[PDB]
Amino acid sequence: IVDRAKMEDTLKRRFFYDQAFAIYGGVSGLYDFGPVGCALKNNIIQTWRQHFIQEEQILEIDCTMLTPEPVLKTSGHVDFNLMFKTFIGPGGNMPGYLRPETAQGIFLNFKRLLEFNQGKLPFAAAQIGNSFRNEISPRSGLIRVREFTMAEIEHFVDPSEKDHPKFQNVADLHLYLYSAKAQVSGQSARKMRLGDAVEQGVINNTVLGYFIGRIYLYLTKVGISPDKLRFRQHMECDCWDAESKTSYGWIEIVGCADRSCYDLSCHARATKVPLVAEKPLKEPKTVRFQKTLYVEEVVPNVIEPSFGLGRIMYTVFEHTFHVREGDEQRTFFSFPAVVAPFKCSVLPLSQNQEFMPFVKELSEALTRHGVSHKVDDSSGSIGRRYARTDEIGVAFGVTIDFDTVNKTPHTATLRDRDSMRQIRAEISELPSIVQDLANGNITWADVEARYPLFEGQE
Amino acid sequence: IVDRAKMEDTLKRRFFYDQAFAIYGGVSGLYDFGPVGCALKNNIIQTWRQHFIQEEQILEIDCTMLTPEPVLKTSGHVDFNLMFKTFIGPGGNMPGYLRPETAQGIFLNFKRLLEFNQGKLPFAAAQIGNSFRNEISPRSGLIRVREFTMAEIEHFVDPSEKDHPKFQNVADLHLYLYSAKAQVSGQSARKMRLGDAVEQGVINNTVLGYFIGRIYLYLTKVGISPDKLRFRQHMECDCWDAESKTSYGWIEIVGCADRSCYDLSCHARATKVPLVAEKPLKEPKTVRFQKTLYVEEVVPNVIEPSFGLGRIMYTVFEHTFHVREGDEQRTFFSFPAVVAPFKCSVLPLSQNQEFMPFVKELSEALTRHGVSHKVDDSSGSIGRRYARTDEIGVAFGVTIDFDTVNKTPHTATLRDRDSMRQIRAEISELPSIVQDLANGNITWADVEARYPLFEGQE
RNA sequence: GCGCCGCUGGUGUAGUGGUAUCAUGCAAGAUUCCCAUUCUUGCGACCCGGGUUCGAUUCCCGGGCGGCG
RNA sequence: GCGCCGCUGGUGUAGUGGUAUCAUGCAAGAUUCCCAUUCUUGCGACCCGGGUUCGAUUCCCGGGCGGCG
Numbered sequence A, B: 001i002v003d004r005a006k007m008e009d010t011l012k013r014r015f016f017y018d019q020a021f022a023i024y025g026g027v028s029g030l031y032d033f034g035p036v037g038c039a040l041k042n043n044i045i046q047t048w049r050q051h052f053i054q055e056e057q058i059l060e061i062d063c064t065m066l067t068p069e070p071v072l073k074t075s076g077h078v079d080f081n082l083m084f085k086t087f088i089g090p091g092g093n094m095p096g097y098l099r100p101e102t103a104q105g106i107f108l109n110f111k112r113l114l115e116f117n118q119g120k121l122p123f124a125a126a127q128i129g130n131s132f133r134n135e136i137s138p139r140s141g142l143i144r145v146r147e148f149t150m151a152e153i154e155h156f157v158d159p160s161e162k163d164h165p166k167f168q169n170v171a172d173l174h175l176y177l178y179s180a181k182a183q184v185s186g187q188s189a190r191k192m193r194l195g196d197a198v199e200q201g202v203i204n205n206t207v208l209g210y211f212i213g214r215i216y217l218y219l220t221k222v223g224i225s226p227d228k229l230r231f232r233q234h235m236e237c238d239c240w241d242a243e244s245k246t247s248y249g250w251i252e253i254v255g256c257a258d259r260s261c262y263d264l265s266c267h268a269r270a271t272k273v274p275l276v277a278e279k280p281l282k283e284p285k286t287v288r289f290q291k292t293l294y295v296e297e298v299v300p301n302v303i304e305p306s307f308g309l310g311r312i313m314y315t316v317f318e319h320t321f322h323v324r325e326g327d328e329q330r331t332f333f334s335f336p337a338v339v340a341p342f343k344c345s346v347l348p349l350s351q352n353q354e355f356m357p358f359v360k361e362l363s364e365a366l367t368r369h370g371v372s373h374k375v376d377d378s379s380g381s382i383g384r385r386y387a388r389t390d391e392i393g394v395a396f397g398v399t400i401d402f403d404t405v406n407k408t409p410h411t412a413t414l415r416d417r418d419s420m421r422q423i424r425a426e427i428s429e430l431p432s433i434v435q436d437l438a439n440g441n442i443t444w445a446d447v448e449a450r451y452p453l454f455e456g457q458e
Numbered sequence C, D: 001g002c003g004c005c006g007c008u009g010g011u012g013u014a015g016u017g018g019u020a021u022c023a024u025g026c027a028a029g030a031u032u033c034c035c036a037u038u039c040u041u042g043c044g045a046c047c048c049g050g051g052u053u054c055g056a057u058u059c060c061c062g063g064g065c066g067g068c069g
């Protein structure tokens, strides 16, 4: 786990990721994600989407990566430059950049987003996408690259109605908070309950509180260990950072920054286009002339949690990376079964032909159930292929053995990657089992309780 | 349907997509996809992934969008330029471009891809991602833009073993083929069966045949009508194009081009790095000196189906776009229930408070079942809100009515967007129903057969 | 690209050297209890920059964007 | 960025002005019938360009990339 060299090796060898254009020499700070890396990235993203977007009914959008210079001048990003400069169309009349963040488009599409939500508040938009920084010296691999996938969430809330109705769901949750006070006081982080936290005013409100809870739950869900995960409040526009402890030290992997008055303002000035919600009045005010007002203009506070996926990924790598006891050439990852690149591996004992039927029958069966599987029927022994599949963090292994070919209820075995423990179950309900473990409704323990274990080949 | 102005209007108004940076004046050929557009895009992509990637067990990868000039010189793309030019890092020693296609990275990562598949053939890689063209005059909206999402598939096959074992699944399929012969002969396309097609040699092989079948099935699955969908063979490196008929005419939406000798070669020359598979020999040849050879080097043929998602999207728009009979202000889309941005809309009759419970209870219930839903509890009448939800192509509508508040088995109604037909079913199994219709296991007809219809409010 | 006009609430429009008509839409209220009901009330716009003018959204010049070869 | 070395099959390495050692890995065969078994056989490499040389992967110069401030 602590050994970054072994890990880096296992990552490179099995093509989790790799230096970009390595046949042309490679280019620093640019990385390509192979089959397993891509699969893990995708799984992580799907989980994120159905964690925040579905649960909060967030308006997600696709925006363009190119950006006209005036847009990035209004936001003060422009101000030898760390952005990627190009030109648009025919000639150099219209210079643009590659977006440094996927936040801007949301703001620039605010009016239509607000209309879509019927003009009502609060409302959340979000953008999952690639952003680009012309860093000078990228090191640490994924930690500092020049192009990367981030998932951003914009929460637009009435400055006067900033109080979240789903907060008692995250109320009893215990986190490591690293407040600015504790930082200037030469102290360390503290394990507080969330509600206690907001009461004592360490966390401004229950919206930031709720977000912090959910963000926690997500980051732990994908495989980050709580003990090495904290929330450091920014110190001298109130920002909180979800940070993880790695071999490189404490790195920022999520940025929760909540800034009221704005760039929404900025753009509204530069373009002279009001970007403002409106709230009807319970009691219409009359104000020269008699002039009753029935609505008030509202520029909404904005909470912005932005997730850096390269770093969430890497953190998962370091925390999950384990080495077996005995054969230390055998390494594996401990990916949670909901993000594992492959939930299942389909393996026969030896190259014996009578195994070919059941292998295919179930491989076509797992697909029908939508399970990501890797069927390994190559030359080497069962132990070797296990080492291979464990190495890429395959969650479970289905072994077809001689007792599969000679039994009335045809049974195969199911091996837990982590524990090296096995059970034996009929081949007809194996896809059901695997599928459900991959969708987190049950863990390995309950499978171990529901089915008879593997004691030996009869 | 034929009316592009009405459609364009409904697209703009409900924010399916919109001109990029419109508050800054907008920029031609760049478009941002709102909530519904993004949802449809995502659904389409998920369906694509579980259509090709899962079923063929394709090695999917994430590659970088930036690209060093030598890479694109080897591929002869460079040769006032239609690509987006920038520089990498500190200064202008290292100029690069924005990838015009997501194909290159796959080739550049070929060796590790081939190793991952144990060196065996055949094997498929694929890349879903954005590509960039500095077009001069973009028109037709999505048809010709400057940045767009394409999904590419690389199939690597032994030139001598080009014969697909899953072809009898697409054998009895009937398509419109537009062969080059028919084109130079002043004829039109022909509705051939696929197997007949390959026998008479109009389609070179059963791999191109199989791909063509699957591509067909996919494009029809997402909502493209067969009658306005054909496969035109390229005429004077054998290429086939999946084309659709729109108001703009026949446009190319998928490119199936199958070119043996290569850019794999090109890169292998420029970099001096052999990109070649190897095949063991059944009978080891002995060839001066006695020198037995046991493997032959094989440069594999490559089949490349590339999908243009902007165009597949637009095609879906034009084909699905319908206008009601009577109130022609009422327009709707006929999105297949597997790609519909929202499968369900949750609607009460009137603003009456006693409806608030059941609405929430099921909205939290649909989420638990993972169903994308839009709960509309706004001021206007049921007809207005229907018009709204139909307008964005919501697949089904759940109506909470007075008979929901006063019945022992609490029942609500389910309305079919297309037909305007309704049924009535208990609120406890509604998420099940909706969920399954959204996962294509049953159609509306079987629901209409399984449940009692809506005849009137008791 | 090059060309002939054009750009007014979210959408569709009338109008003029003295800051804007009507319809739809969206909210709130009341009606209404199945398919944009009705009434009331409220919300929102002259694509940018420069020039000419006492004053331009209107006239002229140049961005940008759109329709079409 | 600037700096001190460095780059040899997929990975880890020995070696030298005359084109490369060993281990692992991956295939095929045979053993083996639960956790990288064993034997046999096969597959694969000197990061690029220039210079000096009869000849460089080795020496020098400059790309690129990596480790580290």
Ligand SMILES: Nc1ncnc2c1ncn2[C@@H]1O[C@H](COP(=O)(O)O)[C@@H](O)[C@H]1O
Pocket (backbone or CB within 6 Å): A133, A135, A142, A143, A144, A145, A146, A148, A150, A252, A253, A254, A255, A306, A307, A308, A309, A310, A311
């Ligand atoms: N050079 C970079 N490489 C990887 N991630 C980055 C980089 N810069 C910013 N991020 C991500 O940005 C998030 C914080 O937002 P910000 O620091 O404002 O960009 C973190 O989650 C990071 O993962």
Ligand SMILES: Nc1ncnc2c1ncn2[C@@H]1O[C@H](COP(=O)(O)O)[C@@H](O)[C@H]1O
Pocket (backbone or CB within 6 Å): B133, B135, B142, B143, B144, B145, B146, B148, B150, B252, B253, B254, B255, B306, B307, B308, B309, B310, B311
């Ligand atoms: N300017 C463009 N806009 C949208 N799609 C494009 C464009 N150029 C190529 N494509 C897509 O590329 C595919 C065919 O490949 P190719 O024409 O070689 O790029 C089609 O499916 C198109 O959708």
